[PDB]
Write a protein that binds this ligand. Structure first.
Ligand SMILES: [Cl-]
Lengths: 325, 325
């Protein structure tokens, strides 16, 4: 950011960026700000790009200090409003600089370091990569079974698929909390519940998708959805199944259509769905050729099903480095 | 405590108090401890009573400091283990000094300042007085009705006494949380829920009884019990009805017997029940004579009911200062 501030030494801006620069120079905090090396003096309105980028540097500093404290200890005294909280609270001031530069005939300048920076921000965000959480279905099954046993209502394990679907649906559309603090938990059970609490405690733009290994029925996706909602995951992430064994690839389109049939999920999925297609285990239990061909059929029929339900499908290819995977 | 430390200058103790004083002088924290004015030097095992009472002063000092912080700000860094947390963790060392003194033929000394102190602790505890929480039944009903309405299960208001009873019982004996953070609350609703949260945050020996104004049915007491359990009140306080209007005094023995009829409540009540008897409103809506007489009969029949159910009843007489109350 300091190198970018050095280059954005222009003085022409449109009335927009001038107004905003006046805003920042208003709350300029006439202080020494000696923790910085460069630009430790309050930036003058002569060079307005440097003013706005100056506020951007302050919010970066405080974001770094907050993350470093949050990591090094368990907590941080750094105020959240002093940091970039949004993926675009960061982007906004840079967008403004770009609009101003183009407005003032400086598109060549704007397409330089400022553009590089814009693409880095829009591409990498506040957390360099979005993290996926992958876990096998049977662990979610164990969790739910502990819950239904504890609620004196049966055993989710022993329940047929239809019973699982109806119950999960009723609990997702219901308004009463499920388990409480007093739920008996295995180390595994508490592992997955705690991972959900960890996901809820953390920023939304840090995570990607929750991938369910050995997914076979909608009860598994709905299970993860309910387990998220009940772990108070404020902005729950998209759930995606992983079909890797060959039989799962044969049965996959049927299962996806049956999932989209659920009006609730089709309404909350918001027209977009991702499903992972594994390449590792297919050519292991059956013929490599049979695996490749069945994969082709799988992609084809998955797209068919998604178009049939008016949902934008993006398929996740779990390819390896070796041709055998 | 310092004056007590000064008088307890004996050198004879039994082996019990000797062992303990040696323990305390072991972890004596060989430091300056200059915040105290008197006894700032590590107390020598020569004066064992002073060793023990000296530790008592450390725990009192830290208890006062924690209480003062907890009051003046919202929180305290003072570790809880440094304080007296139990109303008798305090009593123990003093009991020990008393036992030791009597062992050594010093019962007279034990019956001086030490005894006064024992009685002051055992009578006033860590919180000078135990605080009652009183609220009228209709407010608990409003809360419950908001919950049953929000849970799309009906209207607690419109429900018969029997329906209220069966539902409350099922919820008391159930293990699932009731409402969540998303329960719509009036300012009154959130008032009573918040008082329960305040009760849960605070120590148990700080509170006494929860008095229900306008109590008429077991549903009212069961209601307060459920609201305590659901507000995570770890050690819920005893619920006690208040009969003050003349009709309520007439119906009181019946309503109290009807309460004891619920085996669930009678088994949890631990053989003890308190019920309040108001003296203010009776001689206002009827005569003073009719009210006095009805109060007498009411006490009589209440005792009969409690003896029939093997419950030790203690009655709370809300007498005023004027004869008319
Ligand atoms: Cl119980």
């Amino acid at each position: 950011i300091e190198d970018l501030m050095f280059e954005m030494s222009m003085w022409r801006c449109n009335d927009e960026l001038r107004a905003r620069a006046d805003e920042v120079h208003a709350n300029s905090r006439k202080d020494a700000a000696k923790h910085y090396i460069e630009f430790w003096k309050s930036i003058p309105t002569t060079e307005p790009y440097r003013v706005i980028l100056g506020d951007v540097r302050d919010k970066l500093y405080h974001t770094r200090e907050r993350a470093h404290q949050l990591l090094s200890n368990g907590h941080s005294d750094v105020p959240v409003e002093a940091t970039f909280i949004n993926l675009e609270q960061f982007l906004e001031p840079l967008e403004l600089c770009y609009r101003s530069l183009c407005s003032c005939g400086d598109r060549p300048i704007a397409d330089g370091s400022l553009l590089d920076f814009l693409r880095q921000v829009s591409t990498f965000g506040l957390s360099l990569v979005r993290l996926d959480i992958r876990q096998e279905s049977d662990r979610h099954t164990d969790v739910l079974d502990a819950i239904t046993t504890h609620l004196d209502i049966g055993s989710y394990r022993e329940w047929s698929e239809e019973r699982r679907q109806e119950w999960l649906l009723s609990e997702l559309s219901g308004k009463r909390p499920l388990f409480g603090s007093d739920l008996p938990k295995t180390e595994e059970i508490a592992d997955v519940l705690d991972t959900f609490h960890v996901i809820a405690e953390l920023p939304a733009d840090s995570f990607g998708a929750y991938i369910i290994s050995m997914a076979t029925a909608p009860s598994d996706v709905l299970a993860v959805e309910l387990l998220q909602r009940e772990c108070r995951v404020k902005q729950p992430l998209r759930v995606v199944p992983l079909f890797e064994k060959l039989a799962d690839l044969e049965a996959a389109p049927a299962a996806v259509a049956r999932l989209f049939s659920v009006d609730w999920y089709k309404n909350r999925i918001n027209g977009k769905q991702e499903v992972m297609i594994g390449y590792s285990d297919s050519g292991k239990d059956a013929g490599r050729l049979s695996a490749a061909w069945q994969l082709y059929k799988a992609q084809e029929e998955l797209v068919k099903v998604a178009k049939e339900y008016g949902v934008k499908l993006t398929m996740f290819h779990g390819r390896g480095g070796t041709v055998g995977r």
